[PDB]
């Protein structure tokens, strides 16, 4: 009932059709459509679904932390100051 | 560079592979900088002597005949 060559359509610059199907696959990836489609494949029961929510919200919540830390300790990366001592 | 058994004899003391490898490390860093007559004997204190054998084929002498 919508317009039609407007959504998820991305446009071909001098015929690098490689770089549009990236750029296309990109952005269903960060909107979330493909693991959407991929999970929508098989229906998963709702406490299935549960779970896999909890697990990836833990998940995102220990890789944030993890990468929070690295970031901060990696300016310690630097050479050693006190060589021999 | 001696070797850690080397420096273990000159020490009398016993050493790890990473204590040896600190050793040295701290050594070469000695090495590099502008070292003076005293920094480059206390080097040379640790450095040994490599004999390089030429690989060059020894020449046999020219004899003559009767």
Redesign the interface.
């Known amino acids: 009932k919508h317009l039609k060559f407007i959504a998820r359509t991305v446009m071909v610059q001098e015929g690098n059709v490689e770089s549009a199907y990236r750029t296309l696959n990109r952005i269903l990836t960060m909107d979330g459509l493909i693991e959407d489609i991929k999970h929508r494949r098989y229906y998963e029961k709702p406490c299935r679904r549960r779970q896999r929510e909890s697990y990836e919200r833990c998940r995102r919540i220990y890789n944030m932390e993890m990468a929070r830390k690295i970031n901060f300790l990696m300016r310690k990366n630097r050479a050693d100051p006190w060589?021999?001592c | 560079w001696l070797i850690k058994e080397e420096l273990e004899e000159m020490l009398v003391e016993k050493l790890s592979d990473l204590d040896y490898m600190?050793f040295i490390?701290?050594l070469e860093?000695l090495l590099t900088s502008q070292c003076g007559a005293a920094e480059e004997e206390f080097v040379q204190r640790f450095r040994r002597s490599v004999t390089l054998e030429s690989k060059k084929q020894l020449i046999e002498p020219v004899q003559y005949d009767e």
């Open positions: 060589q021999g | 600190q490390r701290l860093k």
